[PDB]
Enzyme design. Sequence first.
Site, PDB file in Angstrom:
ATOM      1  N   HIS A 165      -4.412  -9.392  -0.120  1.00 47.94           N
ATOM      2  CA  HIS A 165      -4.822  -8.002  -0.066  1.00 47.94           C
ATOM      3  C   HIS A 165      -6.312  -8.045   0.161  1.00 47.94           C
ATOM      4  O   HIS A 165      -7.065  -8.114  -0.791  1.00 47.94           O
ATOM      5  CB  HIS A 165      -4.476  -7.251  -1.360  1.00 47.94           C
ATOM      6  CG  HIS A 165      -4.671  -5.779  -1.272  1.00 47.94           C
ATOM      7  ND1 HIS A 165      -3.641  -4.869  -1.139  1.00 47.94           N
ATOM      8  CD2 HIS A 165      -5.809  -5.048  -1.321  1.00 47.94           C
ATOM      9  CE1 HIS A 165      -4.136  -3.648  -1.071  1.00 47.94           C
ATOM     10  NE2 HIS A 165      -5.442  -3.743  -1.262  1.00 47.94           N
ATOM     11  N   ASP A 191      -1.816  -2.305  -3.890  1.00 44.49           N
ATOM     12  CA  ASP A 191      -2.044  -0.851  -3.951  1.00 44.49           C
ATOM     13  C   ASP A 191      -0.799  -0.012  -4.181  1.00 44.49           C
ATOM     14  O   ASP A 191      -0.625   1.027  -3.557  1.00 44.49           O
ATOM     15  CB  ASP A 191      -2.763  -0.333  -2.687  1.00 44.49           C
ATOM     16  CG  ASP A 191      -4.283  -0.690  -2.665  1.00 44.49           C
ATOM     17  OD1 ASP A 191      -4.711  -1.312  -3.658  1.00 44.49           O
ATOM     18  OD2 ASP A 191      -5.052  -0.403  -1.693  1.00 44.49           O
ATOM     19  N   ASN A 203      -7.042  -3.398  -4.525  1.00 45.90           N
ATOM     20  CA  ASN A 203      -8.375  -2.940  -4.937  1.00 45.90           C
ATOM     21  C   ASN A 203      -8.214  -1.590  -5.691  1.00 45.90           C
ATOM     22  O   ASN A 203      -9.028  -1.282  -6.566  1.00 45.90           O
ATOM     23  CB  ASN A 203      -9.181  -2.720  -3.665  1.00 45.90           C
ATOM     24  CG  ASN A 203      -8.353  -2.066  -2.671  1.00 45.90           C
ATOM     25  OD1 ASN A 203      -7.115  -1.899  -2.920  1.00 45.90           O
ATOM     26  ND2 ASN A 203      -8.906  -1.750  -1.496  1.00 45.90           N
ATOM     27  N   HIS A 204      -7.168  -0.810  -5.385  1.00 45.45           N
ATOM     28  CA  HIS A 204      -6.868   0.420  -6.144  1.00 45.45           C
ATOM     29  C   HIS A 204      -6.142   0.202  -7.478  1.00 45.45           C
ATOM     30  O   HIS A 204      -6.622   0.631  -8.521  1.00 45.45           O
ATOM     31  CB  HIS A 204      -6.059   1.426  -5.339  1.00 45.45           C
ATOM     32  CG  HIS A 204      -6.815   2.078  -4.220  1.00 45.45           C
ATOM     33  ND1 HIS A 204      -7.653   1.451  -3.391  1.00 45.45           N
ATOM     34  CD2 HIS A 204      -6.821   3.308  -3.757  1.00 45.45           C
ATOM     35  CE1 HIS A 204      -8.166   2.257  -2.484  1.00 45.45           C
ATOM     36  NE2 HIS A 204      -7.676   3.410  -2.688  1.00 45.45           N
ATOM     37  N   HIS A 231      -3.825  -5.434   2.770  1.00 43.89           N
ATOM     38  CA  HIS A 231      -4.827  -4.457   2.392  1.00 43.89           C
ATOM     39  C   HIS A 231      -4.944  -3.432   3.503  1.00 43.89           C
ATOM     40  O   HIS A 231      -5.126  -2.247   3.255  1.00 43.89           O
ATOM     41  CB  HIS A 231      -6.127  -5.177   2.065  1.00 43.89           C
ATOM     42  CG  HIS A 231      -7.340  -4.313   2.073  1.00 43.89           C
ATOM     43  ND1 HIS A 231      -7.609  -3.407   1.070  1.00 43.89           N
ATOM     44  CD2 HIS A 231      -8.379  -4.250   2.940  1.00 43.89           C
ATOM     45  CE1 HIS A 231      -8.786  -2.853   1.305  1.00 43.89           C
ATOM     46  NE2 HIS A 231      -9.269  -3.340   2.433  1.00 43.89           N
ATOM     47  N   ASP A 274       0.806  -1.208   0.000  1.00 49.95           N
ATOM     48  CA  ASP A 274       0.000   0.000   0.000  1.00 49.95           C
ATOM     49  C   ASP A 274       0.839   1.258   0.000  1.00 49.95           C
ATOM     50  O   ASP A 274       0.700   2.127   0.861  1.00 49.95           O
ATOM     51  CB  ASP A 274      -1.000  -0.033   1.147  1.00 49.95           C
ATOM     52  CG  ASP A 274      -1.820  -1.251   1.082  1.00 49.95           C
ATOM     53  OD1 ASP A 274      -1.203  -2.258   0.721  1.00 49.95           O
ATOM     54  OD2 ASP A 274      -3.046  -1.220   1.305  1.00 49.95           O
ATOM     55  N   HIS A 325       0.654   3.362  -2.401  1.00 52.05           N
ATOM     56  CA  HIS A 325      -0.292   4.364  -2.882  1.00 52.05           C
ATOM     57  C   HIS A 325       0.296   5.517  -3.738  1.00 52.05           C
ATOM     58  O   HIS A 325      -0.044   6.703  -3.583  1.00 52.05           O
ATOM     59  CB  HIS A 325      -1.152   4.866  -1.726  1.00 52.05           C
ATOM     60  CG  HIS A 325      -2.253   3.920  -1.356  1.00 52.05           C
ATOM     61  ND1 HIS A 325      -3.556   4.083  -1.776  1.00 52.05           N
ATOM     62  CD2 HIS A 325      -2.236   2.781  -0.623  1.00 52.05           C
ATOM     63  CE1 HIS A 325      -4.299   3.096  -1.302  1.00 52.05           C
ATOM     64  NE2 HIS A 325      -3.522   2.295  -0.596  1.00 52.05           N
TER      65      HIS A 325
HETATM   66 MN   LIG Z   1      -4.228   0.438   0.262  1.00 51.95          MN
HETATM   67 MN   LIG Z   2      -6.609  -1.830  -0.505  1.00 51.27          MN
END
Ligand SMILES: [Mn+2]
Ligand SMILES: [Mn+2]
Lengths: 376, 378
Positions: free
Chosen positions: A193, A54, A104-105, A221, A14, A16
């Site tokens: 995740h 992510d 999920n992103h 996640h 993550d 990001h």
């Molecule tokens: Mn994330």
């Molecule tokens: Mn996520």
Amino acid sequence: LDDENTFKILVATDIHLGFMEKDAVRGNDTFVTLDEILRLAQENEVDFILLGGDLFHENKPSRKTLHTCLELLRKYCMGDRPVQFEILSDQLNISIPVFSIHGNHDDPTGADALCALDILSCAGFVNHFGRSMSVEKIDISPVLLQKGSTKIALYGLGSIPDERLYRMFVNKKVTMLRPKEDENSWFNLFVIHQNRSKHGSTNFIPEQFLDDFIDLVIWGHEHECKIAPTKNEQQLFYISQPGSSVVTSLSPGEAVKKHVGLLRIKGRKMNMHKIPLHTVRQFFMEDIVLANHPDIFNPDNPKVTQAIQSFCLEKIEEMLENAERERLGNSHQPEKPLVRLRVDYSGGFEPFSVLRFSQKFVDRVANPKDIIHFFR
Amino acid sequence: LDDENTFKILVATDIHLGFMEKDAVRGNDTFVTLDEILRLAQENEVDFILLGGDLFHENKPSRKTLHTCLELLRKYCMGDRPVQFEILSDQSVLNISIPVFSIHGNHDDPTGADALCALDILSCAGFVNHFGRSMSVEKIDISPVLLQKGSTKIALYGLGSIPDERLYRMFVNKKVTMLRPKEDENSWFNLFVIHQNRSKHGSTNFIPEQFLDDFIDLVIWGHEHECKIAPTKNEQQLFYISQPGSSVVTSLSPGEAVKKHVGLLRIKGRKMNMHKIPLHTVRQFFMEDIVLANHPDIFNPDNPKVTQAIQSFCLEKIEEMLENAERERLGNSHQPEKPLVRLRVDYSGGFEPFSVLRFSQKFVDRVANPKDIIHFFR
Ligand SMILES: [Mn+2]
Ligand SMILES: [Mn+2]
Ligand SMILES: [Mn+2]
Ligand SMILES: [Mn+2]
């Protein structure tokens, strides 16, 4: 010597990339933290990087995001030293491979239903693994790594909507193929995740659902840092939940100091050192329950909404100061802290405008607007 | 002038690259035919190539297959002339002068740790635009790639191969839905490429033409190998369906015997036209049926020397097919030398098979399928 039988792995999740890319203050956050993570990877002469999802904040990364990222990978992942392990599975030197799953992103999208990672993969820097195809049943196959005498069977599951995955587990449709040659010779590593906490009835995945033959689970996640492996009492595997490397939501969990992991696997045994990320924007957070102090705050009192308001300015004033304190030894940390104050007005209290607050702190906080929160 | 408002599109499907790569005789077939196809694309200064599936015979193409292919694309798809149309949709992948738009079939389908497709490798190298691939499990929402050239606008819809049973169910349950463009639904030519069973196999093992949204204009139907490339109107829905052949014979069937073609498709405004172009490099495939029960005068059910009398006629039928082949190959210098040949024998009545060995041998060097030269059934 002995290290030639030991996998050194940098573990992160993550990241990001590109989160709040356009914001004036925070827009370079993720790109700097990614620089730190890769730099650590390189300093520790890691065998490969292992990410739990992510990587990109958006499933269609901006040119800027995607180029900055490629530049960084180009910088830290190439070098003189040869890759020291081999893939026993199927399908300018690269010295630090990156194995990742999709979150999920950064999930699959577009006409070709690819993932940001697949672009990275194309450039030569990433090995996207773990992505499931089937609709009816999920069969997970391991990437097989081997370094000297020690053998990792690396299992992945790219993000799936939790409701579906729960159902799949219950109906005995999620099955993990164990290697053909010598099941027991392998260290069993699993990257996922998914939701770990409770959300709906089926909106999470119970640790118990995972095959007990698995040795280490990287749970990716969840953004709250819990990177130090902890044993699951029913299944007995360790679960490591590295944080994210940016705060994307002002929650208690996200306030826990962010870390990356340095993971060593020799034979069928492992160890996890945690490394703190210094470039992560600070995030301080405190709770204040009004009903807890009747002496300081009076339920019926027209000047109580002013008395409270005056204490918040003090709490915030001190948090901001403790921040300036820590940033003393830390030259890498961005200057403007995130700050949040949660106010439970249970009893006979009432909210107030954040405007005066937003203004008085505008240049000493990175979230002037979101600096305060109320609830029953 | 007027051509600047017209899309010129080379249309092909089931090229099956690398099919019988290792076979001594046939192993270079697909790569040569692909050369023809790309060469046609280039000669006709086409706007882009549009494929309906199974570009690769195997979902994990051999290094050789994949490299030959990239070499070919490199050769014919790059050049001086700029691409003359634009993608109004989001994303698209030394100048490229002929883009290739493709969907995946059941052969070149997604696979591997990353669940990618051979096309995705091609896409990576810069030569192909993989479109049409569905994600969802519960419902299929198809979105169009939006192309525009001058004033004329194509809304290109794709469906990468899906197992027919599932797709049928989806249609029946009203879960397959096609998003129409936001801006001016009616301004677009609606093009739909699919890779599915068209004929009857099971109860649900095919997809009825009626199931497809009637707003579609032209349907490129790509899974079926039999050439039916000339667009024909569907009487209930009123769109045209074009079913280009494959460009190799991968199964000795009546359908596969029909002469292979590629298509030259023109779209102006919301109207189109389809010229067919014959592929000259395709290995010939001649096939005849022989029903024994049909001729009692020549063949007698009870007769110990009838299995020898039949056998002697087969050698003649085959002998003539082989000759008609050498005949056509007269004007055709591009065609590979050794024809595929099949003879289907219906022994209904009171007849019996015989060994293909003597046959396999007598033709070994005049046929490319010595072993499979004959077939029997009731
Ligand atoms: Mn994330
Ligand atoms: Mn996520
Ligand atoms: Mn095919
Ligand atoms: Mn097919």
